[PDB]
């Protein structure tokens, strides 16, 4: 039973989860009310799958999903929409104020009297699992509450569990495009928890995914919906190792085993292949070597930075549908001899591959075609330090002058958080650099004794 | 009555020994069911090497099945053979070692051991007269390769005087699966040099090789690659089972291929392979099987024999044929290829033959090489250990479960040390 | 350093004294003459060795050897090399049943006793009586025991378990978890030498009563250290005194072994054969770069196959001062055995060791060029640019 | 075994008026074919004794063979075939090949020729 708990966190968070468990629901058969008729019509068998979803006596499934947000109205859109009747009624919802993009709001002053209901049902949906994976956590970075509250919520986990895997789905702030003037502050701020208590980071830019929709999918005017089911679409290419039967089935500990080289560099970026519009999914063959090379092209990823500025530390693959090891073996291949891809010289191997045979699913509504082969990318690299640079420079624009900071002193932070963060900032990026260096010519400086 | 137990460990494991169990058990005509359904009378006479007998008429094969991930079992129960075994032998845990040896040798794989070595000699009381072991796994990955070295090292503390084979898939230049395979692959051969007699090589890349070039197939899966394994086993103690005009025991093999204690890894071998579409044109005789034997394209663990010595070989032929025949063709293959054996073990070749061949063949024969060749394998790995322990690529998360870099040292040293015993021999012209 | 060899020849026993007696060893100055007695006419073969032992009579004063004869001439010198901060071995050789625990521990309740309670007494009297304000020692000790292909503690208590044989990077091989007792004085070291002793695998055959079982190595550490407040360095010197007791090869047709006591006297065996093949392949190395050019090209000698070869990787070459003591039988019928004996023991005067010995390299390194500015300002007074 | 087979060659040989000797069929270069056969010889020399023993051996080929380690097992037979043995008649599995292929017009024999 590998079983997953899901936390949602802030408005990003809420509605990202809508799109994965719509597509977690239409994937193995569950109606909107929780009922499943495929084993009424069958007969019998494991459809019920215990990494989401657990099953009641009367035939009942409930998801292992934990909402949580601090302004009523983003669940209250859940609780009176068309899946009402799945979720548990307890959705851990303060009806008070909101964080107001404030992450000592968040922290400090509201965070508290929510967090113990919080812990109280997590440990209430983790007592009914055996056998528990990890956790995996939407929010986002610039907000208040997904800063703030993800943070007290990661502390408190750590403490608590410890041992098991702590996952990180966040959307990171854009180079250009914006929607506050205190998302550096908030975006900061939130180094030290996602550091030290999560063990795999994965960033999303909304520029980045715009840019996708616009020039792969032709939809000129994408809203979060596309958004929202595209990062559904990761989500669910990272977890079908543990619910389908594949030929390579990688779980959520060899993830960890083989991405990340030292502890304070798991920042990976991801990115899918075969996002493609229907009328577009014709004229094109849509091979392994063609969705493997699409995986490293810099158009397609979904943070805006380029891999050609850095180089490649690790690479985890994972195929869905009509694959064969031969053709992976090919393109891997085929792949290392191109020069425009480097790779730290100290991982020669530099490649995890794994295979699942259960197709991708298409979402009535959706825009991605049907399509027989996918792959999903995952890729720690050191090209996203540029993503922290820019975002660094920010904050120093602001922070100069001591610009907004009399809201944050004002629920209970001092200066010194806001510059412990940005030493730590400083920090990671010196780590990040250090690292990608080639090895010292003849690391041994130079060798040879009599014979 | 010589019998062999038979252990499986890890994914790779798992699916060969599945793949294996299939073709013996056509060899002596076993029902899926368990029943026997043959036609020749001597499939039963020597059954009891690999099979126990049940009550009604039924045969259990003498297998252990062992993994820290159940899924695996659930495709084995779920499958062609899969009621075949018996469920008391499906050994397995929860939360596997993710590719960590650490995780499969020291912190998970030693609660698991005790059952596993319960159930070992639960089958080994039972046997007549127990022969040796048998273990099929990867190195290069994670509950296989550290599950398999404690097994081995426990099977060894207990069983001093029995035979250990080991059929071991090892990691390829170009086909990579798993970022941390080096330090998995060097820990493991640090443990199979000390604690083991025989050691078969296993190269994905020579297999799809064979299958592109030789049988000329389009769509390999790790089927096809079962089945040459699978063949390959059942080729080297075919003379256990079935009379033979010049018999060839598993100790026979291990006497007249291991000069010294620590060179017993082999290259294995097979023929014949026709890619179902030249079957018609050549003629099936011993001198093709003979020079497919040795054709450098046609070994299994991706090392030229042209880049060293024959230390030794043994050649097992199944089929009603000459000895004559095999002789002076072995003693061609010899002459004429001179430069490729070592000028200290005059007749460096051993010769079997069984009577009974496969069920779809006339003739067969299976090549079991011993060669400084094999040192090329043991470089490459050893070169890209040191490409990331010289940095620390990943090593907390090995040092995070109770190990420490001094193993990691010892290791790379006996490699090193195996690898500077290969080549002493490689070098013709012994003096100066 | 080349290897110091010894040789002794024992007296007759119950078994040679059943049978027919006749001698065949001979021994004059360092010379030792065997004679084939299938072969009366044929040139009666000698071996040129560095000390020679005959002790097959007591009265006489025919170059006899008594057990504090052998003792000064290999063990005292062997013991001041120690002092002097080298790490030292002697290790016994032959085959079973000849002299190798009357020379290396002798019989406790006698006076003839072996080198190793020797050597620790006069190790204990040396620092005893040169014990000073500055001057001060420290030691420390160890016995182990490989009894087939496993490593087992006798000074410690009932251990049942077997112990595991690691490899320092830059020490080399050792056995982890070994019970390392620190001892102050004569007595105690001889109670653990007596526990030791008892604590050993012993078993009876027809060549032997107390024919040994299992290979033998007692360790001794020792610390030499000297107090200054000013310029001198503490634990000025540190050494390794092994003594090792070889169980001798068999013959299973004059053994009469069956059963566990065959199985040992094959493990035995190996444990032998292996060990031969070292002690010649080391000889012919450092035969040849030495004698023939000094190309160095590669030479491998194979360590790996036994841990008794293992674990004495640096006793029987590199890093130590080693001596080998050869036991001898005069028995005629022993002929074919005994000369097997005197052709190793022929070779292992050729090998070379290559030991110097220090401690704390950073010290070394401090050293080093403080000696060398010392050198040339010495230089450059003598000169008059000082 | 060699308790059983002693005991068996005894019955037989109490069966036996007027024994006039021993056929002993082995092959060198086997394991059992040298050391049971030295095994075997040894105690019938010191049972018997006076009976005649003679061996039917099958020395190994000069360039042919089917074991690497046959030179090893051919040598230790020299005691037994030398002291025990009264008479010793050796073949060659080469000669009866060429025997066969030039006499007999035997292309591919095997050993039942
Ligand atoms: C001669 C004929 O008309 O059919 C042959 C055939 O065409 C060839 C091509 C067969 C065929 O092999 C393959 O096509 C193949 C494909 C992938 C991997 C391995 C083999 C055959 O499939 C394989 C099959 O092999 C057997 O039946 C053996 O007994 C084999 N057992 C199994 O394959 C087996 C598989 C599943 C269940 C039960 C038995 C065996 C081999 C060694 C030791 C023991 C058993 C045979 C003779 C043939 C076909 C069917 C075409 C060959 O294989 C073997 C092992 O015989 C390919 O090289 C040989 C040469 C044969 O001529
Ligand atoms: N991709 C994607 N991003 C979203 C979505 N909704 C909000 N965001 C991001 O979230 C950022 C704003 O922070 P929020 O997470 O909404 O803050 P919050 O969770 O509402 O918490 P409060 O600030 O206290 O209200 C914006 O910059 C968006 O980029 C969404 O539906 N999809
Ligand atoms: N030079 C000697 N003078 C007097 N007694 C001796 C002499 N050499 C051996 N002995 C005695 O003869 C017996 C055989 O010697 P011993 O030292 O036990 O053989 P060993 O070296 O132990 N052979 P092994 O222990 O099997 O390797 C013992 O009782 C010794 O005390
Ligand atoms: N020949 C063969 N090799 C396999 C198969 N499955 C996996 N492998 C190899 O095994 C390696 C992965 O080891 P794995 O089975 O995951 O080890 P485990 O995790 O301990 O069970 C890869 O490098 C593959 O090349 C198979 O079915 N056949
Ligand atoms: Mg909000
Ligand atoms: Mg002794």
Same mark, same amino acid.
């Given at each position: ?11 990003a ?13 239409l994937e ?7 009922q ?11 459809d019920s799958?215990?990494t989401?979803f657990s099953?009641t006596g009367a035939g ?6 934990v909402?949580?947000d601090? @302004?009523?109205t983003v669940?209250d859109?859940?609780?009176?929409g068309?899946?009402?009747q799945?979720?548990?009624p307890?959705?851990l ?10 992450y000592?709001?968040?922290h400090?002053?509201?965070?508290k ?5 919080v812990?109280?049902?997590i440990?209430?949906?983790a007592d009914?699992?055996?056998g528990l994976?990890?956790?995996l956590?939407?929010?986002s ?5 997904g ?22 789905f966040?959307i ?6 914006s929607?506050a003037?205190v998302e ?10 996602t550091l030290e208590?999560?063990?795999?980071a994965?960033?999303?830019?909304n520029?980045?995914?715009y840019?996708i929709?616009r020039?792969?999918?032709?939809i000129?005017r ?5 958004l929202?089911?595209?990062? &559904?679409?990761?989500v669910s290419?990272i ?7 594949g030929a390579?089935?990688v779980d ?11 502890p304070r560099?798991?920042f990976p970026?991801?990115?899918y292949?075969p996002?493609?519009?229907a009328?577009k999914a014709?004229?094109?063959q849509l &091979?392994?070597?063609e969705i493997?090379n ?5 158009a397609? *990823?979904?943070?805006?930075?380029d891999?050609?500025?850095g ?7 994972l195929?869905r549908?009509d694959?064969?090891?031969?053709d992976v073996?090919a393109?891997?291949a085929?792949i290392?001899t ?7 010289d100290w991982c ?18 959706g ?7 996918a792959?999903?990318m995952?890729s720690?690299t050191t090209?996203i330090?540029?993503?922290?640079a820019?975002?660094?420079?920010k904050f ?7 610009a ?5 002193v ?5 200066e010194?958080?806001?510059?412990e963060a940005? @030493?730590?900032?400083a920090? +990671?990026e010196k780590?990040? #650099? ?5 090895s010292?010519?003849g ?6 004794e009599?014979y | 009555?010589?019998?062999?137990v038979?252990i ?7 699916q ?7 073709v013996?058990?056509? @060899?002596?005509?076993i029902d899926?069911?368990?029943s026997?359904?043959?036609? &020749?009378?001597? *499939? ?7 099979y126990n007998?049940?009550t ?5 094969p ?10 695996t ?7 062609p053979?899969? *009621?075949?075994?018996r ?6 845990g ?7 040896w650490?995780?499969?040798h020291?912190?998970?794989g030693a609660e698991?051991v005790?059952?596993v070595?319960?159930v070992?000699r639960?089958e080994?009381?039972?046997?007549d ?12 990955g994670?509950?296989?390769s550290?599950?398999?070295?404690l097994?081995i090292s426990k099977?060894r503390?207990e069983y001093?005087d029995?035979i250990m084979?080991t059929f071991?898939?090892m990691?390829s230049?170009?086909?990579?699966d798993?970022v ?5 692959? !060097?820990l493991?051969?640090?443990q ?16 799809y ?9 389009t769509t390999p899966?790790?089927?096809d ?9 059942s080729?080297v103690?075919?003379?256990?089972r ?10 026979k093999?291990?006497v007249?291929?291991?000069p010294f204690?620590r060179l017993?890894?082999?290259?294995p ?17 011993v001198?093709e099987?003979?020079?497919q034997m ?5 070994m ?13 070989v043994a ?5 009603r044929?000459s000895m004559?025949?095999?002789d ?5 293959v010899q002459?004429?290829?001179?430069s490729?054996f070592?000028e ?15 069920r779809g063949?006339?003739?067969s ?6 060669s400084?060749?094999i040192?090329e394998?043991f470089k ?6 040191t490409?990331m ?11 995070? #479960?109770?190990?420490?870099?001094? @193993?990691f040292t010892?290791?790379e040293?006996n490699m ?7 080549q002493?021999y490689?070098?013709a012209?012994?003096?100066? | 350093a080349?290897?110091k060899?010894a ?5 007759f ?26 072969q009366?006419?044929?040139?009666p ?5 560095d000390?020679?032992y005959?002790?097959?009579t007591?009265?006489?004063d025919?170059?006899?050897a ?6 000064r ?6 013991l001041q ?5 080298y790490?030292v071995?002697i ?5 079973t049943?000849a002299?190798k ?5 002798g019989k406790?309740?006698?006076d003839q006793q072996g ?5 620790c007494?006069d190790?204990?009297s040396?620092?005893?009586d040169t ?7 420290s030691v420390?000790?160890s016995?182990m025991?490989?009894y087939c ?8 208590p ?9 490899e320092?990077?830059?020490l080399g091989?050792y056995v982890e ?16 030498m007596?526990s ?7 078993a009876?055959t027809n ?8 290979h ?9 250290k000297?107090?200054?407040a000013?310029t001198?360095?503490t634990?000025?010197?540190?050494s ?15 053994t ?10 094959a493990?035995?065996?190996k444990?032998? !054969?292996?060990?031969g ?5 080391l000889?012919?190395?450092?035969s040849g770069?030495?004698?023939?050019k ?9 360590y790996?196959?036994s841990v008794?070869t293992?674990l004495?990787?640096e006793?029987?070459?590199?890093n ?10 005069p ?12 052709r190793?023991?022929?070779r ?15 010290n ?9 500015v010392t050198?040339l300002?010495? +230089? ?5 640019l000082?």
């Amino acid at each position: 039973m590998r079983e997953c708990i899901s936390i949602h966190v802030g408005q990003a968070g809420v509605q990202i989860g809508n799109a994965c468990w719509e597509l977690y629901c239409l994937e193995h058969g569950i109606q909107p009310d929780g009922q499943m008729p495929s084993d009424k019509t069958i007969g019998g068998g494991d459809d019920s799958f215990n990494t989401f979803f657990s099953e009641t006596g009367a035939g009942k499934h409930v998801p292992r999903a934990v909402f949580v947000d601090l @302004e009523p109205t983003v669940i209250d859109e859940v609780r009176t929409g068309t899946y009402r009747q799945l979720f548990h009624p307890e959705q851990l919802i303060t009806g008070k104020e909101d964080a107001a993009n404030n992450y000592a709001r968040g922290h400090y002053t509201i965070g508290k009297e929510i967090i113990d209901l919080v812990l109280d049902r997590i440990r209430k949906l983790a007592d009914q699992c055996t056998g528990l994976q990890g956790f995996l956590v939407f929010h986002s970075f610039g907000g208040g509450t997904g800063s703030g509250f993800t943070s007290l919520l990661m502390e408190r986990l750590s403490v608590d569990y410890g041992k098991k895997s702590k996952l990180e789905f966040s959307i990171y702030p854009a180079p250009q495009v914006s929607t506050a003037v205190v998302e550096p502050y908030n975006s900061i701020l939130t180094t030290h928890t996602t550091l030290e208590h999560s063990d795999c980071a994965f960033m999303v830019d909304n520029e980045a995914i715009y840019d996708i929709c616009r020039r792969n999918l032709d939809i000129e005017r994408p809203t979060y919906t596309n958004l929202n089911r595209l990062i &559904s679409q990761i989500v669910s290419s990272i977890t079908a190792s543990l619910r389908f039967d594949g030929a390579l089935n990688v779980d959520l500990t060899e993830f960890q085993t083989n991405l990340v080289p030292y502890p304070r560099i798991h920042f990976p970026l991801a990115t899918y292949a075969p996002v493609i519009s229907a009328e577009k999914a014709y004229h094109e063959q849509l &091979s392994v070597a063609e969705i493997t090379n699409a995986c490293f092209e810099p158009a397609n *990823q979904m943070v805006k930075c380029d891999p050609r500025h850095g180089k490649y530390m690790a690479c985890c693959l994972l195929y869905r549908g009509d694959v064969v090891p031969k053709d992976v073996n090919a393109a891997i291949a085929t792949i290392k001899t191109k020069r425009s891809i480097q790779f730290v010289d100290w991982c020669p191997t530099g490649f995890k591959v794994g295979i699942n045979y259960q197709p991708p699913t298409v979402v009535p509504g959706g825009d991605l075609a049907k399509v027989q082969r996918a792959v999903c990318m995952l890729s720690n690299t050191t090209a996203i330090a540029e993503a922290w640079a820019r975002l660094d420079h920010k904050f120093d624009l602001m922070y100069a002058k001591r610009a907004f900071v009399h809201w944050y002193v004002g629920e209970g932070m001092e200066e010194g958080e806001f510059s412990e963060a940005r @030493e730590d900032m400083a920090a +990671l990026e010196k780590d990040y #650099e250090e690292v990608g260096v080639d090895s010292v010519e003849g690391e041994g400086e130079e060798e040879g004794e009599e014979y | 009555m010589r019998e062999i137990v038979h252990i499986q460990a890890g994914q790779c494991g798992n699916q060969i020994g599945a793949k294996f169990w299939e073709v013996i058990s056509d @060899e002596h005509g076993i029902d899926p069911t368990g029943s026997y359904h043959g036609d &020749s009378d001597l *499939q039963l006479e020597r059954i009891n090497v690999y099979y126990n007998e049940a009550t009604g008429n039924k045969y259990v094969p003498r297998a252990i099945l062992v993994d820290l991930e159940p899924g695996t079992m659930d495709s084995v129960r779920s499958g062609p053979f899969g *009621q075949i075994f018996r469920p008391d032998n499906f050994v397995f845990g929860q939360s596997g070692a993710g590719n960590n040896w650490a995780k499969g040798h020291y912190t998970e794989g030693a609660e698991l051991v005790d059952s596993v070595l319960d159930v070992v000699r639960k089958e080994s009381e039972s046997c007549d007269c127990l022969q040796g072991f048998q273990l099929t796994h990867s190195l290069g990955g994670g509950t296989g390769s550290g599950m398999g070295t404690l097994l081995i090292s426990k099977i060894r503390e207990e069983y001093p005087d029995r035979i250990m084979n080991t059929f071991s898939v090892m990691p390829s230049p170009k086909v990579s699966d798993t970022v941390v395979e080096p330090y998995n692959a !060097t820990l493991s051969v640090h443990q199979l040099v000390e604690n083991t007699d025989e050691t078969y090589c296993i190269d994905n890349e020579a297999l799809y090789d064979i299958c592109f070039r030789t049988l000329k197939l389009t769509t390999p899966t790790y089927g096809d690659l079962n089945h040459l394994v699978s063949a390959t086993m059942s080729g080297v103690t075919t003379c256990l089972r079935f009379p033979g005009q010049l018999n060839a025991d598993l100790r026979k093999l291990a006497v007249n291929m291991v000069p010294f204690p620590r060179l017993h890894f082999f290259m294995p071998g097979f023929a014949p392979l026709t890619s179902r579409g030249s079957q018609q044109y050549r003629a099936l005789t011993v001198p093709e099987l003979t020079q497919q034997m040795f054709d450098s394209k046609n070994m299994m663990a991706a090392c030229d024999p042209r880049h060293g010595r024959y230390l030794t070989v043994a050649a097992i032929f199944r089929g009603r044929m000459s000895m004559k025949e095999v002789d002076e063709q072995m003693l061609n293959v010899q002459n004429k290829n001179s430069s490729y054996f070592v000028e200290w073990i005059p007749n460096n070749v051993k010769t079997a033959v069984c009577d009974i061949p496969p069920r779809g063949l006339k003739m067969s024969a299976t090549f079991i090489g011993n060669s400084t060749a094999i040192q090329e394998l043991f470089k490459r790995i050893s070169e890209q250990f040191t490409a990331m322990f010289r940095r620390k690529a990943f090593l907390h998360w090995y040092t995070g #479960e109770g190990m420490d870099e001094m @193993e990691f040292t010892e290791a790379e040293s006996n490699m090193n040390d195996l690898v500077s015993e290969y080549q002493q021999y490689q070098d013709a012209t012994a003096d100066e | 350093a080349s290897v110091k060899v010894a040789v002794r020849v024992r007296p007759f026993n119950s078994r040679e004294m059943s049978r027919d007696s006749k001698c065949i060893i001979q021994m004059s100055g360092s010379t030792t003459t065997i004679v084939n007695p299938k072969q009366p006419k044929e040139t009666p073969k000698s071996f040129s060795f560095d000390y020679s032992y005959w002790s097959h009579t007591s009265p006489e004063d025919i170059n006899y050897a008594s057990q504090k004869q052998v003792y000064r001439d290999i063990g005292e010198e062997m013991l001041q090399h120690a002092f002097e901060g080298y790490n030292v071995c002697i290790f016994a050789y032959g085959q079973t049943g000849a002299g190798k625990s009357y020379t290396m521990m002798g019989k406790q309740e006698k006076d003839q006793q072996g080198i190793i309670p020797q050597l620790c007494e006069d190790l204990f009297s040396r620092i005893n009586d040169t014990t000073n304000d500055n001057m001060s020692y420290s030691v420390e000790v160890s016995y182990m025991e490989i009894y087939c292909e496993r490593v087992r503690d006798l000074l410690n208590p009932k251990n049942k378990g077997n112990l595991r044989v690691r490899e320092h990077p830059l020490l080399g091989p050792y056995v982890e978890d070994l019970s390392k007792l620190a001892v102050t004085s004569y007595n105690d070291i001889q109670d653990l030498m007596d526990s030791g002793n008892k604590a050993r695998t012993v078993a009876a055959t027809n060549m032997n009563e107390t024919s040994s079982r299992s290979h033998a190595v007692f360790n001794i550490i020792f610390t030499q250290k000297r107090h200054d407040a000013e310029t001198n360095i503490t634990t000025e010197k540190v050494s390794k005194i092994s003594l090792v007791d070889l169980a001798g090869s068999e013959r299973a047709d004059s053994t009469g072994a069956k059963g566990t006591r065959l199985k040992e006297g094959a493990n035995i065996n190996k444990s032998l !054969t292996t060990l031969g093949k070292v002690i010649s392949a080391l000889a012919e190395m450092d035969s040849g770069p030495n004698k023939n050019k000094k190309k160095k090209k590669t030479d491998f000698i194979p360590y790996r196959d036994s841990v008794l070869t293992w674990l004495l990787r640096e006793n029987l070459g590199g890093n130590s001062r080693t001596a080998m003591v050869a036991a001898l039988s005069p028995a005629d019928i022993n002929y074919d055995e005994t000369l097997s004996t005197l052709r190793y023991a022929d070779r292992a005067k050729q090998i070379r060791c290559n030991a110097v010995i220090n401690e704390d390299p950073n010290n070394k390194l401090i050293r080093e060029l403080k000696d060398e500015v010392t050198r040339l300002r010495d +230089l450059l007074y003598a000169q008059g640019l000082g």
